[PDB]
Amino acid sequence: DRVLSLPAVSKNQVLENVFHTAPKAPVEHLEKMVSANSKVYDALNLQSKRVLIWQVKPALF
Amino acid sequence: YLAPLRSDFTEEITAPKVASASNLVNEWNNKKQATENLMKLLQAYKDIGDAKSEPLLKNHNPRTFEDRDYPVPDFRTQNLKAGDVPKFFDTVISTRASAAIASKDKFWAGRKTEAEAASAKASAAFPRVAVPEWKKGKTVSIENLNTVTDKYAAALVPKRKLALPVLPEGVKKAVEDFAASVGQAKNASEVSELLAKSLAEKAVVTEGGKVVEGFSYVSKAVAAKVIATRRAEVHERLLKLWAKRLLVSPELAIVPLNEFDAQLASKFEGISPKYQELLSAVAQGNK
Amino acid sequence: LGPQMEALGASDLLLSEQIRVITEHRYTPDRLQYKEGMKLADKIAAQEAALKEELKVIYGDNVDVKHFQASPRTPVQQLFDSLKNAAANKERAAKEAAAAASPYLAYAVTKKQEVQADPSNIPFDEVLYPQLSEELLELELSDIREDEIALEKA
């Protein structure tokens, strides 16, 4: 019964409790927010190619 | 943008059907308050763990919460037969591991209660998420989007970093040129490389932008060499242990290591006779 | 002893494969510790897949992931690995900023590569969290110490 004097938990259970959730990368926030603000730029900048200012405010001619 | 063409008339003069509020500002404000309560909760967790001066990995390690001084059940008492001892061992290991995991869960429940108590009594000033400034009828300037991306990229810089020195092109060509000036033209590669590597070996650690002094860290390479050295010496102890027993009695090699627990029983007369007569018959020797 | 004639890390097979073969030798499939060793081998194989993904950028597709699992890289070695690919990173960032639809996306690409190109911006866990790296090391050393305590008891 030498095995019963060993730590009973596991190396596997220790790895699943110490690393319970996969950590969030720091570049993930930059990538998500830059791909959203790309849509913000495309919609709401006057130098955009698909600016929404001619759709929401039709120009007077 | 396409719409169906209804082409029907309205024959009744009724008031228009005003739809109700359809709460999204309330639900998104509840989501924002839930996110900030979670941020306050994580801050309270960090504050309690910093006040107790406790290790980070210790409370998530379930082996911390194992008893290790618990009276272990003797398998010779528990009346098991020949194939039964490994399942008894697995049952004892299971209950000890699950007791350690449940003790960790009880600790984290108490820590959650104390952290929510400290989290309620904390006024929160967190920096907001950097979004581009957009007024109601106005447009969004490219300069503001670039400063918002600058904030996102300033978040990419680590808070404490190794000032890993890249040798600049002017400094490299100056020392490379000096090597040519001495006249050893073909080892200029190695002299500029060894200047870069000698600056890299004593790489310094920065607080934020300023330098922390008296900072010593253990690299992952150094820690892995420590682990490999300790692992090799314990494996050497294991080889010496089995070398002694196989020098005294080599017949132990006819019973495989995984099958051994499947032979045992609580009493000696109940031990499985699959290997007994073969073991005693090999123990006489080669004649 | 079989596969236990060599140490856990020191072999030609990868650490997930070595843990798999050692666990197959030490226990029978009905055992608890067989199942726990197989799950541990799966976690180590996940770590090896992640290390292969981060090393495929620098050393190509046919990278010896066993070599860098057995000997993790120096901060100095990570410096020179970043300096080896720096010109290709700069040129690829320039052509990506040329290929970008928005000039906003072009600024984002060049700013992201300007931050990534500095090897001082490499997030070393031992520098950011020294005590946490200490405790990861003492976790592995505590497992090895438990096995040594068993050998001392024997």
Side-chain angles (χ1 to χ4, degrees), chain B residues 56-101:
Chain B
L56 280 180
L57 285 190
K58 178 178 182 290
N59 294 132
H60 299 267
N61 194 11
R63 283 183 182 171
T64 295
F65 301 94
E66 201 179 351
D67 290 331
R68 303 308 302 277
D69 208 10
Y70 199 61
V72 63
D74 208 352
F75 79 106
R76 297 159 198 124
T77 295
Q78 298 290 116
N79 283 105
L80 281 315
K81 305 301 181 291
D84 293 333
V85 182
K87 183 60 71 177
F88 170 76
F89 282 164
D90 294 341
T91 292
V92 172
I93 292 296
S94 284
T95 64
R96 266 168 75 225
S98 299
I101 286 168

Side-chain angles (χ1 to χ4, degrees), chain A residues 1 3-11 13-14 16-18 20 26-27 29-30 33-34 37-38 40-41 44-47 53, chain B residues 57 60-63 66 68 72 74 76 89 92-93 96-97 101 104 129 131-132 134 139-142 145 148-149 152-153 156:
Chain A
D1 44 358
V3 70
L4 301 182
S5 300
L6 260 61
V9 183
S10 304
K11 190 57 195 303
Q13 297 186 357
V14 161
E16 91 187 351
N17 281 275
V18 158
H20 46 92
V27 79
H29 177 81
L30 179 134
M33 291 304 274
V34 155
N37 297 346
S38 176
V40 168
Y41 172 81
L44 316 158
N45 193 258
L46 290 163
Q47 280 77 239
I53 203 170
Chain B
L57 285 190
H60 299 267
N61 194 11
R63 283 183 182 171
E66 201 179 351
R68 303 308 302 277
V72 63
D74 208 352
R76 297 159 198 124
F89 282 164
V92 172
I93 292 296
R96 266 168 75 225
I101 286 168
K104 186 173 76 72
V129 180
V131 293
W134 180 34
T139 68
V140 175
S141 66
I142 177 63
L145 286 151
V148 163
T149 306
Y152 297 154
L156 266 189

Side-chain angles (χ1 to χ4, degrees), chain C residues 120-131:
Chain C
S120 173
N121 287 137
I122 293 173
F124 293 105
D125 270 18
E126 50 263 35
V127 181
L128 286 164
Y129 298 102
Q131 185 177 1

Side-chain angles (χ1 to χ4, degrees), chain C residues 25-119:
Chain C
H25 174 82
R26 284 181 69 176
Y27 321 102
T28 45
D30 52 295
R31 296 305 296 275
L32 184 152
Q33 294 168 342
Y34 187 94
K35 309 166 192 313
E36 294 304 307
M38 291 310 167
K39 293 183 222 186
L40 167 70
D42 292 344
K43 287 185 181 293
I44 296 310
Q47 291 171 7
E48 293 167 350
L51 189 72
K52 183 181 175 65
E53 181 66 28
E54 290 295 327
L55 259 57
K56 192 176 66 67
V57 177
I58 300 171
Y59 295 90
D61 174 48
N62 309 338
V63 54
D64 195 16
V65 65
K66 171 61 182 64
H67 168 92
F68 296 90
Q69 175 176 46
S71 291
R73 285 181 296 175
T74 323
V76 184
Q77 185 55 231
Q78 289 177 62
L79 197 163
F80 288 124
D81 284 346
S82 66
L83 289 200
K84 187 172 74 176
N85 287 100
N89 286 352
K90 183 66 67 69
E91 196 262 358
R92 189 176 30 87
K95 295 301 289 183
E96 277 176 18
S102 304
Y104 169 69
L105 283 180
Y107 183 86
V109 160
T110 63
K111 182 77 199 209
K112 186 182 180 179
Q113 197 264 344
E114 169 198 329
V115 178
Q116 283 174 355
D118 200 25

Side-chain angles (χ1 to χ4, degrees), chain C residues 127-146:
Chain C
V127 181
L128 286 164
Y129 298 102
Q131 185 177 1
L132 167 73
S133 71
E134 265 176 29
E135 291 173 20
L136 290 160
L137 166 78
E138 81 181 34
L139 189 71
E140 277 274 351
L141 289 192
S142 296
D143 202 37
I144 306 173
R145 173 61 182 157
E146 287 297 323

Side-chain angles (χ1 to χ4, degrees), chain B residues 35-198:
Chain B
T35 308
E36 204 168 330
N37 287 337
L38 268 173
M39 283 210 172
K40 285 159 64 166
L41 190 52
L42 293 204
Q43 186 54 254
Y45 275 129
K46 188 180 176 183
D47 286 339
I48 290 173
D50 281 18
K52 289 190 184 292
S53 177
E54 63 189 16
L56 280 180
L57 285 190
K58 178 178 182 290
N59 294 132
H60 299 267
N61 194 11
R63 283 183 182 171
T64 295
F65 301 94
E66 201 179 351
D67 290 331
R68 303 308 302 277
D69 208 10
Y70 199 61
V72 63
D74 208 352
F75 79 106
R76 297 159 198 124
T77 295
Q78 298 290 116
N79 283 105
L80 281 315
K81 305 301 181 291
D84 293 333
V85 182
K87 183 60 71 177
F88 170 76
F89 282 164
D90 294 341
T91 292
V92 172
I93 292 296
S94 284
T95 64
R96 266 168 75 225
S98 299
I101 286 168
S103 180
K104 186 173 76 72
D105 288 353
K106 179 156 164 294
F107 171 78
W108 274 118
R111 178 57 58 95
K112 183 189 283 189
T113 302
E114 185 178 0
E116 288 173 331
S119 176
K121 52 172 59 63
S123 45
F126 300 123
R128 323 311 291 166
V129 180
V131 293
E133 181 182 1
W134 180 34
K135 302 291 184 181
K136 190 165 212 72
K138 308 287 192 296
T139 68
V140 175
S141 66
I142 177 63
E143 287 85 34
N144 206 339
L145 286 151
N146 288 348
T147 59
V148 163
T149 306
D150 283 4
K151 293 184 184 180
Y152 297 154
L156 266 189
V157 175
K159 65 178 181 68
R160 177 162 41 215
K161 55 185 190 174
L162 269 173
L164 283 193
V166 181
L167 217 54
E169 180 68 32
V171 169
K172 286 189 287 190
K173 198 163 123 160
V175 304
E176 160 149 349
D177 256 357
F178 195 109
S181 104
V182 132
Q184 40 171 10
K186 295 180 291 294
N187 64 7
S189 57
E190 74 185 7
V191 69
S192 66
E193 187 274 344
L194 194 143
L195 181 58
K197 189 179 182 293
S198 163

Side-chain angles (χ1 to χ4, degrees), chain B residues 234-246:
Chain B
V234 166
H235 163 78
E236 183 180 1
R237 294 285 299 275
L238 174 72
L239 291 204
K240 286 177 186 193
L241 187 144
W242 279 112
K244 293 175 216 156
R245 282 125 187 87
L246 291 180

